[PDB]
């Protein structure tokens, strides 16, 4: 038993990097997108860990289905600009 | 912040109160699918879930349900590390 | 002279050797040959004076058979073991990772008593591991050695002790069998003779005598000499044999009710039936010798007999009374004395053959039990040996012993000497032996009987001191397991050519004279009195006519390693032990050279270790390459020898054989044709001979530290090659098989630049820490990626790949070139373990140069680590410009009592620079006894100084005073052995002359390269959650209890708290502290280490109500 | 001697009924883990083996009483249950210790914290710690009384987090992952920050 | 040599709504179980 390492123990450095990724992502790119951040947050669920389908936004708010997808596509295209797509390009691993 | 540590003689009532469920099977894990067997040793319903907020049948698999007991398998959805603090008892004739 | 090669090495020996050194591997090979049984063994046994010899396997099989079932109606038997041929060869087994064994066949005969049938035929008993020519066992591709075990031989042992209350002398005797109940008699302080049977309560022996069938008249007739016997008899309340039998049965077996037949047959089966009580073959002989029974007849029945019990009682009674001699009726006269169990006349040696025989016996017992179970379960007509014979238990026992027994050990392959000494190791531990925690001073101390059998020097330094030793050079093992040593028969004060092998108890009855005693050409002793050893091992002067035996050689007492310490007699026992132990740790160097000064053993040992290649038959060399040597024998036969090249040893040391012969060169049988790892021209070369100056230098050699010149690094003098193997396996999983692939998720294209197309690293590449060796991937299954990772993948359009990387990566701190790759794939045979589809081995070799922290040592126990390596211009240099290679501190020698190294240095300087003794005015007085060959020798001439017979004080002084000059016709070293050096740094000459010469320095296998690891964060334990230990993992250093005491003494409350909580097992604290350090913040407060919580919830178990209040 | 024991129950609020057990507790599984070793092999603490036996016997008794077995068999089963519980709490105390494969006795609960090994003297009073290393020592005569020579690699490993912080804040690495990657490969910029 | 055994933003303000049941055993021991609003409460339960 003294040679079997625990494979579920929290790795310190990793546990740090993640909270930095969650800090450098939620702050900058989210804020420069104004209210277009909200749709992204619900789409991937990074605000409460609850991914939501398109209709789950339209069930309450007046936005329509295809418009949400268009907004998502535009945000996806413009957030991949190197000036703002290079700082987050080191956390892929 | 501890004041004192008191030792005593545990009674049947104390042992029963410590427990979250009676163990009544010697099974530990099934041979195929390598998962804990119900009502035996390593039982999830007694000692808690193996994964974080994931019950046996998978009906509840997200943090939002924290504290809810699954009505289909009885496994509470909580941290997987509760398995090192949940006790069980054997009622011997 | 024995070796045709025989490199020239003049010797200072003045005594001619009357007996040649025997084979040093005989202890293993002869025992194994006895076990299996071989034609040469049969011939040797016949010649030795025995008829109808029986091997170990035959003995065990005869013991097992015949067998009849309960309520006998039919019988079975085994006989005639046979070995046909080994399945594979040595190196095939070594490479393919399979045991080197041969099949075994035994003829089994099944007989039906009702009809008289015979179902006789051969049965396959399994694969018996076989011994190689070197005396090793290849198990699962690994070479292993079975070490002989020292064990107290079975017999009857008497002793006496002074009581505490009454202070009377109380005598006791114990009968120790191979198997059976323990029987021991005693005399009480009340003057009564009792007996404890099968560890039961004491009672008078008279009841035992009565139960055995003795009326109350024969006891008086026989034991009428003593008075305690009559006291016991009169005090005995029991009357008649029947009365005693009932009491004995009640006491021994109080559970079941007494009966008549059971009571009558109780003692019969307890001791007198071989199936339940058996003295070994040695036990019967020892009992007969002690009590003088069965004098002059073969020993076939070994079980106890009724005569010997009364003989033992009489012996004990007479010994207590005070009689010196004693003779039982029908027996010869024997003396009366107590037994010291440390005497080798009592301690015997279990060789490898006997150790294997015991396991074979156990396996056959289990097989016989299974046969008994199956015998009465099927029909009696269509029943054959195959149906009811299960060979699994015996093969299982054989496999268990080799892979699990403590005696079967992983061979030490640092160098040939290490392996040779391993095979001659005598161990007191192991099953049936001593325990390291239950061994007092008496057992581990040197006993006089050891002389010539067990070396008093070679032994472990640590807690195993005295429990593990080495066999002496000339020692031989008696078939009973006792160690015999040779002596020269001397009669009428004239040494005779006859040689006899004697045992300790046998030599105790003789007077033995030391070999180094003056003798005339005729053989008659020159002196009037001679030095001898007496019965008690006491040393005395006696008249020349009183000696009846003589030592064979002066070095009869030393082992193989101890025999290679020059000037041993000038070194203290502790330092000699340290040097002998160190000799076995020398690592092979890239190039080897024999010492200038040594013993004559280096040669023979090198051949006996079996690492050098010797021509089998006389002939002429035909072809010589770096890989093979082809020799055309004198007749038409021709033989090819394969040379091992860059083969990893058991301890990751390069084993490299190279030829020394040339094409068209005549060679003779037994002549070395290729050198081994640590050999040079057929001799043993463990280190390097180099120039040394004895002086303190600026405090860099303070407290045993050593300074080396940079030359040894530039010229690779102390460089060594180290090879390591890395293994990876691709197997099956419930989620799908894992594949060896060249593409790995999330890896830079540059990283996998040296990977072969299959994903394996390319040969000749230079891998460093963290580099990929073999590419592997395993299925993931569930993903449940985090929202942040999902968004990151979406913005980059990266697939959630099915497989995770599990490639084999170079361990931390490793480096070197890739030299070899081995691949096994289940598709192409490759009988891998179930579930494994691919197996890849990669060999990485690196060349290590001597550096700071590496451990060097001499042959006299003068170990030390290198503290400083200077450039050549800084080292002190001789007045001719020659710089020294090593500086050793002067404060070590005198207090450590290893002055032999100074003589080594002087004689090494003499050897390197030739010498010539002027003989114009006759011969000098000091050189009177030197042999002619030592009168003059050229430069770089090697010399031999055998231990206890070698270069003398005055001879060494004269040779120092009569050396040849250098190229400029001048002498650097004066007649006192000192020279005037120059300071390399300042440049001025040192004020006083310094001792300078040549020393043999060898590189031990203790290198800082492989012991440096540090840790900041790594794997943790499953339960306690504390860091793991060991360099294999990212081991954390243990902060032991004593360190806590020290911290408390300092009053460092905070440091201790952080050590015990934050840095060990405060799970939350660990990650929070890492985050704080990375972010540059104050360290958070610790709390509640996990170990205490585990303790609390462990005490909660086993019903203890432990709780915390506030 | 008898009063020494009797007074404990007299002058307290606890009764001696605790010496007879009606329900044995069970330790959480994590403290007796069933870890899947590499290659699919399973390693299990023998403690959970003992428990199993108890349960088995405790079940058999429940059956024997149910169908009204003769008193001899019921008494034998009760004795077996007693022995199993005894060995669970303290193996080898009364009779021959319970053994599994080979002949090594099983490790009971008491053994887990009894002697030199266990928890008290092996995991509570002294333990292995992070941020630590070890190496051979050599004499430094040029050092001052308050100075020691630390190998470059050992110092780098010990100070890895500090080195990573000083690399990221000095713009040698863009983030913590980059700093760690740089430190692992030991690029030249690392040694400047290390000193 | 290594083995294996069989990290989300914690939040206390927001949680899935739940309803508490109530069960009696043969011995009169009361137990409570928090179930989700989906209900589907079984008629019989296994208590501690
Ligand atoms: Zn469920």
UniProtKB/Swiss-Prot annotation, chain B:
Zn(2+) 1 binds at residues 55, 57, 70, 73. It comes from the Bacteria. Signal peptide: none annotated. DNA-dependent RNA polymerase catalyzes the transcription of DNA into RNA using the four ribonucleoside triphosphates as substrates. The RNAP catalytic core consists of 2 alpha, 1 beta, 1 beta' and 1 omega subunit. When a sigma factor is associated with the core the holoenzyme is formed, which can initiate transcription. Belongs to the RNA polymerase beta' chain family. This is DNA-directed RNA polymerase subunit beta'. It comes from Mycolicibacterium smegmatis (strain ATCC 700084 / mc(2)155) (Mycobacterium smegmatis). The chain holds residues 6 to 98 of 1317 of the full protein.
Swiss-Prot record, chain C:
Signal peptide: none annotated. It is an enzyme of class 2 (transferase). GO terms for molecular function: DNA binding; DNA-directed RNA polymerase activity; ribonucleoside binding. Changing residue 429 to P: Rifampicin (Rif) resistant. It holds the Pfam family RNA_pol_Rpb2_1. Its EC number is 2.7.7.6. One of its GO terms (cellular component) is DNA-directed RNA polymerase complex. GO terms for biological process: DNA-templated transcription; response to antibiotic. The keyword tRNA-binding does not apply. InterPro entries: DNA-dir_RNA_pol_bsu_ext_1_sf, DNA-dir_RNA_pol_bsu_external_1, DNA-dir_RNA_pol_su2, DNA-dir_RNAP_su2_dom, DNA-dir_RNAP_su2_hyb_sf, RNA_pol_bsu_bac, RNA_pol_bsu_CS, RNA_pol_bsu_protrusion. Mutations in the RRDR sequence (residues 423-449) confer rifampicin (Rif) resistance. Rif blocks transcription initiation but not elongation. Belongs to the RNA polymerase beta chain family. The RNAP catalytic core consists of 2 alpha, 1 beta, 1 beta' and 1 omega subunit. When a sigma factor is associated with the core the holoenzyme is formed, which can initiate transcription. Interacts with RbpA, which partially restores Rif-inhibited transcription. DNA-dependent RNA polymerase catalyzes the transcription of DNA into RNA using the four ribonucleoside triphosphates as substrates. This subunit often mutates to generate rifampicin (Rif) resistance. Interaction with RbpA partially restores Rif-inhibited transcription; once the subunit is Rif-resistant however RbpA no longer stimulates transcription. The gene is rpoB.
From Swiss-Prot, chain D:
Signal peptide: none annotated. It comes from the Bacteria. The RNAP catalytic core consists of 2 alpha, 1 beta, 1 beta' and 1 omega subunit. When a sigma factor is associated with the core the holoenzyme is formed, which can initiate transcription. DNA-dependent RNA polymerase catalyzes the transcription of DNA into RNA using the four ribonucleoside triphosphates as substrates. Belongs to the RNA polymerase beta' chain family. This is DNA-directed RNA polymerase subunit beta'. The gene is rpoC.
Curated annotation (Swiss-Prot), chain E:
It comes from the Bacteria. Induction: Constitutively expressed during growth, increases slightly in stationary phase (at protein level). Belongs to the RNA polymerase-binding protein RbpA family. Monomer. Forms a complex with the RNAP catalytic core, specifically with the beta subunit (RpoB); its binding site may overlap with that of Rif. May bind free principal sigma factors. Binds to RNA polymerase (RNAP), probably stimulating transcriptions from principal, but not alternative sigma factor promoters. Partially restores transcription in the presence of rifampicin (Rif) in vitro; overexpression leads to an increase in the Rif tolerance in vivo, with smaller colonies. Seems to act by removing Rif from its binding site and preventing its further binding. No longer stimulates transcription in Rif-resistant RNA polymerase (with mutations in rpoB). This is RNA polymerase-binding protein RbpA. It comes from Mycolicibacterium smegmatis (strain ATCC 700084 / mc(2)155). The gene is rbpA.
